[PDB]
Design an enzyme around this catalytic site. Structure first.
Site, PDB file in Angstrom:
ATOM      1  N   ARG A 248      -2.546   9.932   4.423  1.00 31.93           N
ATOM      2  CA  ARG A 248      -3.387  10.113   5.596  1.00 31.93           C
ATOM      3  C   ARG A 248      -4.420  11.192   5.302  1.00 31.93           C
ATOM      4  O   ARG A 248      -4.067  12.288   4.873  1.00 31.93           O
ATOM      5  CB  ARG A 248      -2.542  10.494   6.819  1.00 31.93           C
ATOM      6  CG  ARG A 248      -1.350   9.588   7.053  1.00 31.93           C
ATOM      7  CD  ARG A 248      -0.688   9.879   8.389  1.00 31.93           C
ATOM      8  NE  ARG A 248       0.343   8.896   8.725  1.00 31.93           N
ATOM      9  CZ  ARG A 248       1.120   8.970   9.801  1.00 31.93           C
ATOM     10  NH1 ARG A 248       0.984   9.992  10.651  1.00 31.93           N
ATOM     11  NH2 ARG A 248       2.044   8.033  10.018  1.00 31.93           N
TER      12      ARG A 248
ATOM     13  N   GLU B 168      23.164  11.400   5.748  1.00 31.87           N
ATOM     14  CA  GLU B 168      23.061   9.964   5.476  1.00 31.87           C
ATOM     15  C   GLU B 168      22.988   9.706   3.969  1.00 31.87           C
ATOM     16  O   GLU B 168      22.274  10.407   3.260  1.00 31.87           O
ATOM     17  CB  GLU B 168      21.826   9.385   6.189  1.00 31.87           C
ATOM     18  CG  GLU B 168      21.476   7.941   5.837  1.00 31.87           C
ATOM     19  CD  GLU B 168      20.215   7.474   6.566  1.00 31.87           C
ATOM     20  OE1 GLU B 168      19.982   7.956   7.686  1.00 31.87           O
ATOM     21  OE2 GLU B 168      19.466   6.643   6.022  1.00 31.87           O
TER      22      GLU B 168
ATOM     23  N   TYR C 143      16.208  -7.538   8.045  1.00 32.70           N
ATOM     24  CA  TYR C 143      16.203  -6.277   8.776  1.00 32.70           C
ATOM     25  C   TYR C 143      15.347  -6.474  10.033  1.00 32.70           C
ATOM     26  O   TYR C 143      14.242  -6.966   9.931  1.00 32.70           O
ATOM     27  CB  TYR C 143      15.655  -5.109   7.950  1.00 32.70           C
ATOM     28  CG  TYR C 143      15.495  -3.907   8.846  1.00 32.70           C
ATOM     29  CD1 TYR C 143      16.605  -3.140   9.219  1.00 32.70           C
ATOM     30  CD2 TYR C 143      14.255  -3.584   9.393  1.00 32.70           C
ATOM     31  CE1 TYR C 143      16.471  -2.061  10.082  1.00 32.70           C
ATOM     32  CE2 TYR C 143      14.116  -2.519  10.255  1.00 32.70           C
ATOM     33  CZ  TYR C 143      15.218  -1.758  10.595  1.00 32.70           C
ATOM     34  OH  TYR C 143      15.061  -0.698  11.464  1.00 32.70           O
TER      35      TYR C 143
ATOM     36  N   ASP D 234      13.994  -4.263  13.468  1.00 34.43           N
ATOM     37  CA  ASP D 234      13.920  -3.191  14.454  1.00 34.43           C
ATOM     38  C   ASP D 234      14.364  -3.700  15.811  1.00 34.43           C
ATOM     39  O   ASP D 234      14.311  -4.900  16.071  1.00 34.43           O
ATOM     40  CB  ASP D 234      12.494  -2.655  14.572  1.00 34.43           C
ATOM     41  CG  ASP D 234      12.193  -1.578  13.567  1.00 34.43           C
ATOM     42  OD1 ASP D 234      13.127  -0.855  13.161  1.00 34.43           O
ATOM     43  OD2 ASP D 234      11.009  -1.442  13.198  1.00 34.43           O
TER      44      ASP D 234
ATOM     45  N   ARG E 286      18.832  12.110   3.856  1.00 29.75           N
ATOM     46  CA  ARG E 286      18.329  12.693   5.113  1.00 29.75           C
ATOM     47  C   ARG E 286      19.439  13.411   5.860  1.00 29.75           C
ATOM     48  O   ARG E 286      20.617  13.075   5.709  1.00 29.75           O
ATOM     49  CB  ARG E 286      17.750  11.608   6.051  1.00 29.75           C
ATOM     50  CG  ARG E 286      16.824  10.633   5.414  1.00 29.75           C
ATOM     51  CD  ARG E 286      16.131   9.763   6.442  1.00 29.75           C
ATOM     52  NE  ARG E 286      16.995   8.717   6.966  1.00 29.75           N
ATOM     53  CZ  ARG E 286      16.553   7.498   7.253  1.00 29.75           C
ATOM     54  NH1 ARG E 286      15.277   7.206   7.035  1.00 29.75           N
ATOM     55  NH2 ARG E 286      17.374   6.573   7.736  1.00 29.75           N
TER      56      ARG E 286
ATOM     57  N   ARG F 217       0.852  -1.179   0.000  1.00 22.37           N
ATOM     58  CA  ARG F 217       0.000   0.000   0.000  1.00 22.37           C
ATOM     59  C   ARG F 217       0.894   1.236   0.000  1.00 22.37           C
ATOM     60  O   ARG F 217       2.090   1.149   0.277  1.00 22.37           O
ATOM     61  CB  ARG F 217      -0.935   0.021   1.218  1.00 22.37           C
ATOM     62  CG  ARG F 217      -1.785  -1.233   1.429  1.00 22.37           C
ATOM     63  CD  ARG F 217      -3.133  -1.139   0.724  1.00 22.37           C
ATOM     64  NE  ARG F 217      -4.064  -2.192   1.143  1.00 22.37           N
ATOM     65  CZ  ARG F 217      -5.135  -1.996   1.909  1.00 22.37           C
ATOM     66  NH1 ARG F 217      -5.430  -0.774   2.324  1.00 22.37           N
ATOM     67  NH2 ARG F 217      -5.929  -3.018   2.238  1.00 22.37           N
TER      68      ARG F 217
ATOM     69  N   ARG G  92      22.577  -3.766   1.526  1.00 22.64           N
ATOM     70  CA  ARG G  92      22.727  -2.338   1.311  1.00 22.64           C
ATOM     71  C   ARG G  92      23.443  -1.759   2.523  1.00 22.64           C
ATOM     72  O   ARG G  92      23.261  -2.238   3.647  1.00 22.64           O
ATOM     73  CB  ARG G  92      21.365  -1.662   1.109  1.00 22.64           C
ATOM     74  CG  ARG G  92      20.521  -2.316   0.019  1.00 22.64           C
ATOM     75  CD  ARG G  92      19.087  -1.794  -0.002  1.00 22.64           C
ATOM     76  NE  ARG G  92      18.297  -2.517  -0.994  1.00 22.64           N
ATOM     77  CZ  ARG G  92      18.325  -2.265  -2.299  1.00 22.64           C
ATOM     78  NH1 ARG G  92      19.097  -1.293  -2.776  1.00 22.64           N
ATOM     79  NH2 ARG G  92      17.576  -2.981  -3.128  1.00 22.64           N
TER      80      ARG G  92
HETATM   81  C1  LIG Z   1      20.766   2.811  10.121  1.00 24.67           C
HETATM   82  C2  LIG Z   1      20.126   1.748  10.973  1.00 24.67           C
HETATM   83  C3  LIG Z   1      19.067   2.404  11.588  1.00 24.67           C
HETATM   84  C4  LIG Z   1      18.253   1.673  12.463  1.00 24.67           C
HETATM   85  N1  LIG Z   1      17.161   2.365  13.103  1.00 24.67           N
HETATM   86  C5  LIG Z   1      16.326   1.644  13.985  1.00 24.67           C
HETATM   87  C6  LIG Z   1      15.215   2.388  14.618  1.00 24.67           C
HETATM   88  O1  LIG Z   1      15.077   3.579  14.348  1.00 24.67           O
HETATM   89  N2  LIG Z   1      14.344   1.709  15.506  1.00 24.67           N
HETATM   90  C7  LIG Z   1      14.556   0.282  15.790  1.00 24.67           C
HETATM   91  O2  LIG Z   1      13.823  -0.281  16.556  1.00 24.67           O
HETATM   92  N3  LIG Z   1      15.684  -0.437  15.163  1.00 24.67           N
HETATM   93  C8  LIG Z   1      16.547   0.244  14.268  1.00 24.67           C
HETATM   94  N4  LIG Z   1      17.637  -0.446  13.630  1.00 24.67           N
HETATM   95  C9  LIG Z   1      17.918  -1.897  13.920  1.00 24.67           C
HETATM   96  C10 LIG Z   1      18.758  -1.918  15.266  1.00 24.67           C
HETATM   97  O3  LIG Z   1      20.095  -1.613  15.046  1.00 24.67           O
HETATM   98  C11 LIG Z   1      18.640  -3.229  16.027  1.00 24.67           C
HETATM   99  O4  LIG Z   1      19.008  -3.080  17.410  1.00 24.67           O
HETATM  100  C12 LIG Z   1      19.547  -4.285  15.479  1.00 24.67           C
HETATM  101  O5  LIG Z   1      18.997  -4.808  14.294  1.00 24.67           O
HETATM  102  C13 LIG Z   1      19.588  -5.369  16.525  1.00 24.67           C
HETATM  103  O6  LIG Z   1      19.655  -6.648  15.889  1.00 24.67           O
HETATM  104  P1  LIG Z   1      20.956  -7.532  16.136  1.00 24.67           P
HETATM  105  O7  LIG Z   1      21.268  -7.550  17.610  1.00 24.67           O
HETATM  106  O8  LIG Z   1      20.701  -8.913  15.600  1.00 24.67           O
HETATM  107  O9  LIG Z   1      22.145  -6.946  15.239  1.00 24.67           O
HETATM  108  P2  LIG Z   1      23.400  -6.037  15.629  1.00 24.67           P
HETATM  109  O10 LIG Z   1      22.996  -4.785  16.389  1.00 24.67           O
HETATM  110  O11 LIG Z   1      24.095  -5.707  14.296  1.00 24.67           O
HETATM  111  O12 LIG Z   1      24.451  -6.812  16.576  1.00 24.67           O
HETATM  112  C14 LIG Z   1      25.338  -7.659  15.897  1.00 24.67           C
HETATM  113  C15 LIG Z   1      26.680  -7.722  16.673  1.00 24.67           C
HETATM  114  O13 LIG Z   1      27.266  -8.847  16.321  1.00 24.67           O
HETATM  115  C16 LIG Z   1      28.828  -8.480  16.156  1.00 24.67           C
HETATM  116  N5  LIG Z   1      29.522  -9.455  15.392  1.00 24.67           N
HETATM  117  C17 LIG Z   1      29.296  -9.670  14.078  1.00 24.67           C
HETATM  118  N6  LIG Z   1      30.153 -10.652  13.660  1.00 24.67           N
HETATM  119  C18 LIG Z   1      30.917 -11.028  14.743  1.00 24.67           C
HETATM  120  C19 LIG Z   1      31.952 -11.983  14.866  1.00 24.67           C
HETATM  121  N7  LIG Z   1      32.525 -12.878  13.879  1.00 24.67           N
HETATM  122  N8  LIG Z   1      32.567 -12.186  16.049  1.00 24.67           N
HETATM  123  C20 LIG Z   1      32.189 -11.441  17.161  1.00 24.67           C
HETATM  124  N9  LIG Z   1      31.173 -10.507  17.037  1.00 24.67           N
HETATM  125  C21 LIG Z   1      30.541 -10.308  15.815  1.00 24.67           C
HETATM  126  C22 LIG Z   1      28.785  -7.361  15.522  1.00 24.67           C
HETATM  127  O14 LIG Z   1      30.026  -6.567  15.713  1.00 24.67           O
HETATM  128  C23 LIG Z   1      27.595  -6.607  16.205  1.00 24.67           C
HETATM  129  O15 LIG Z   1      28.052  -5.904  17.263  1.00 24.67           O
HETATM  130  C24 LIG Z   1      18.488   0.298  12.726  1.00 24.67           C
HETATM  131  C25 LIG Z   1      19.562  -0.353  12.104  1.00 24.67           C
HETATM  132  C26 LIG Z   1      20.368   0.375  11.235  1.00 24.67           C
HETATM  133  C27 LIG Z   1      21.542  -0.264  10.527  1.00 24.67           C
END
Ligand SMILES: Cc1cc2nc3c(=O)[nH]c(=O)nc-3n(C[C@H](O)[C@H](O)[C@H](O)COP(=O)(O)OP(=O)(O)OC[C@H]3O[C@@H](n4cnc5c(N)ncnc54)[C@H](O)[C@@H]3O)c2cc1C
Ligand SMILES: Cc1cc2nc3c(=O)[nH]c(=O)nc-3n(C[C@H](O)[C@H](O)[C@H](O)COP(=O)(O)OP(=O)(O)OC[C@H]3O[C@@H](n4cnc5c(N)ncnc54)[C@H](O)[C@@H]3O)c2cc1C
Ligand SMILES: [Mg+2]
Lengths: 391, 391
Positions: free
Chosen positions: A179, A310, A361, A363, A287, A175, A256
């Site tokens: 609004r 960004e 992806y 949050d 942005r 969609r 990306r």
């Molecule tokens: C630009 C961007 C904007 C975002 N904005 C929002 C938002 O506005 N609101 C929202 O709710 N979420 C947002 N997110 C998502 C947010 O970052 C989440 O907290 C994230 O996706 C948490 O998921 P994760 O813990 O699996 O990943 P991650 O936060 O990426 O944690 C992964 C960790 O694993 C580590 N790691 C990777 N490989 C290895 C290895 N071989 N050995 C040891 N350590 C390793 C990495 O260094 C990293 O620290 C955004 C993400 C991005 C990229």
């Protein structure tokens, strides 16, 4: 010393797992993190010149409608009453955003009531029939009409996706609502706010328990063999890249990335709002974030501000991976890796989770919800009652 | 008005062609340039805060051993007595560079005479036999020895090529000389200097003739059909991308790009030399340029300087293309496009030249030499005596 559990990665997924094991099962947990800081991409830090908290891997806004998650996270931080709102810059003018009565009235030059706006959009979007839409561009026009599409969607899409919207499939639009009220609150979740002491303190609290050790600057692949030789019955929760875990044997998953440019300016206020979208092609960024506005309750300085530009880019092999590209090819590659992952789970006691571990992806609240679920339904039963990790 | 000749692109190749046609054959020439400035990648401009001339697409140092070219360019500019020298930063120390008696004495901690240095390198490079070399890394070690390779070549190569040196073919190293003298003049060409009034003035002089019109901000492909309908017998010299000319029908040619970060600092002097190579992996840039040192004869300010950090990246579709990647695949793709180009030449009077038109890295003097040759041997005979453009 001894460990009951290895967690690879100290983002919200990783730390949720580590915390729940430590405090709910009493388990000794080692968190291996390759970066020099914890928190994964939610990590924040004060800019030195100004003291202003900056979100180092992109603006992070917390929101959720999940009551369980909301109750869980509030044990580690308080939240402000922040509500996210976004504005859009088009042809030298700042517009209320997302598309709604405000933007419509501004753009078309006079007040449109809810009924009149509905009628306007209906008429303009009739240029193309949605089921005849050949691609993204046409489908968007068939939903909001050409004038709105060309002003606020076309070039922003081209910049964010790094692809001409005519070459994106119609498939990627479900969609595209306008609004028919003046409500411009960006998110519609039940709960929303920003952590009062900032994201890093929040994450540090999650890792606070004595039974959790965090080793920074450490790559799991450099240390796993002797760590697991130390503790053979220790299960592993791995939240790093899925393709890397299996030595890219099925190919590389496409992502990306984002580039950021941090700038400190000698004014107290650059744009008067936290986030300004730039919809036109005459500037390369998508942005600009101005971080002082994320925390108005803070006493930040009056003569300086820090902004962040960004930019969107396809990820090269060594770029930070942020959004899965998700081509059909990617999905076939993923398919192969989850088969491998299921076999690694059964044979080596390794679970795969999080944004990187699942090529998704997520949050913050969805990562947390995901980890709570992995804990409750897969990992805790194993740790407590010897249950199988096979689903 | 009327034109005898179209040139697409206003870099050194393009402007050499346009100038020679105008002044040597009296011809009316139109130069179409898509950028908002002329000069192609040699364009320079003063940084506003400091007045310092900055080379906007990378540091440009002029050198040649071609007397004809040297006599030609000096009609459009005077040259300073600048001689290029480069230093290298490794593990917190600044080294004389390229590899020579200076670097060797510094790195190994005592004076090595020419004979002793020769003997040292010989012994260390004997670790690997050059003809046994399996890749770039091994071949480099077989030529300069492991200690020098790991300090000044390994990580710099990895950064510049965006590839692990073990995954680069041994094929890409011809020689890797160590100078057995203290001579650290970077280039060994007969003639060398920097343009006294800067590169942009130089290029503007080349386009000064009344019979040359330069249209900026103009893409050839947007205007060619009606321009050529205007002047059907006008030949075209095209120096834009070869693959784009034929609508990428054979695929895209691969290039490497460069990213730059310009910074103005509140010191009169940041590094005391024009170019510092950064050989270590702990910083992402390859080099830092400090532009005040390119023109010591200028009275630049004393309390500020402008620097430029340089970074290597594979080019995405819309990045500035700087260096051909030149895989076997690329060469097969090129092969197809030059066949197309030869047919376009014969049927449409279009010549292909320059860096982009031929998928080649060209130094300024080599581009000029190339254009002078195209003029003398192909284009002027056509314009003057109706000779065929078919070679
Ligand atoms: C630009 C961007 C904007 C975002 N904005 C929002 C938002 O506005 N609101 C929202 O709710 N979420 C947002 N997110 C998502 C947010 O970052 C989440 O907290 C994230 O996706 C948490 O998921 P994760 O813990 O699996 O990943 P991650 O936060 O990426 O944690 C992964 C960790 O694993 C580590 N790691 C990777 N490989 C290895 C290895 N071989 N050995 C040891 N350590 C390793 C990495 O260094 C990293 O620290 C955004 C993400 C991005 C990229
Ligand atoms: C970082 C970098 C550093 C360099 N350093 C040196 C150095 O130190 N010493 C040296 O001698 N040389 C150096 N060079 C090479 C130098 O820039 C040459 O002058 C250049 O290669 C000249 O060749 P050219 O005229 O064919 O290409 P260009 O200078 O690229 O000129 C091409 C022009 O064609 C225009 N154009 C392209 N497509 C179109 C289109 N469809 N329509 C209209 N116009 C179009 C382009 O906008 C551009 O202006 C360097 C190059 C780079 C990238
Ligand atoms: Mg890329």
């Amino acid at each position: 010393g001894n460990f009951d559990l290895f967690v690879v990665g100290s983002g919200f997924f990783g730390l949720t797992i580590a915390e729940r094991a430590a405090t709910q099962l009493g388990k000794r947990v080692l968190v291996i993190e390759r970066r020099p800081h914890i928190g994964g991409n939610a990590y924040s830090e004060p800019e030195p010149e100004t003291g202003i908290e900056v979100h180092k891997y992109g603006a992070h806004l917390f929101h959720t409608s999940n009551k369980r998650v909301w109750d869980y996270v509030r044990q580690f931080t308080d939240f402000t009453g922040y509500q996210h709102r976004v504005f859009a810059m088009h042809n030298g003018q700042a517009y209320q955003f997302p598309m709604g009565l405000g933007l419509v009235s501004q753009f078309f030059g006079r007040y449109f009531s809810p009924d009149e706006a509905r009628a306007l959009i209906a008429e303009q979007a009739s240029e193309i029939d949605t089921k005849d839409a050949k691609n993204f561009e046409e489908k968007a026009i068939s939903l909001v009409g050409r004038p709105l599409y060309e002003a606020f969607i076309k070039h922003y899409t081209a910049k964010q996706w790094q692809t001409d919207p005519k070459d994106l499939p119609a498939s990627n639009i479900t969609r595209l609502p306008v609004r028919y009220t003046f409500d411009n609150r960006y998110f519609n979740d039940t709960y929303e706010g920003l952590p009062v002491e900032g994201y890093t303190k929040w994450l540090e609290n999650m890792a606070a328990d004595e039974r959790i050790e965090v080793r920074l600057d450490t790559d799991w692949f450099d240390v796993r063999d002797d760590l697991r030789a130390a503790n053979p019955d220790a299960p592993v929760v791995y939240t790093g890249p899925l393709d890397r875990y299996f030595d890219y044997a099925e190919g590389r998953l496409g992502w990306r990335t984002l580039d950021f440019e941090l700038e400190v300016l000698e004014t107290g206020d650059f744009q008067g709002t936290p986030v300004m979208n730039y919809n036109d092609l005459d500037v390369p960024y998508t942005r600009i974030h101005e971080f002082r506005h994320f925390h108005p309750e803070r006493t930040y300085p009056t003569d300086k501000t820090v902004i962040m530009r960004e930019y969107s880019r396809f990820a090269d092999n060594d770029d930070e991976p942020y959004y899965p590209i998700n081509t059909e090819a990617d999905r076939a590659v993923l398919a192969a890796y989850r088969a491998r992952a299921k076999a690694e789970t059964a044979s080596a006691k390794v679970l795969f989770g999080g944004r990187l571990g699942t090529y998704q992806y997520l949050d913050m609240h969805m990562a947390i919800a995901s980890a709570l679920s992995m804990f409750d339904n897969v990992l805790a039963p194993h740790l407590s009652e010897g249950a199988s990790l096979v689903t």
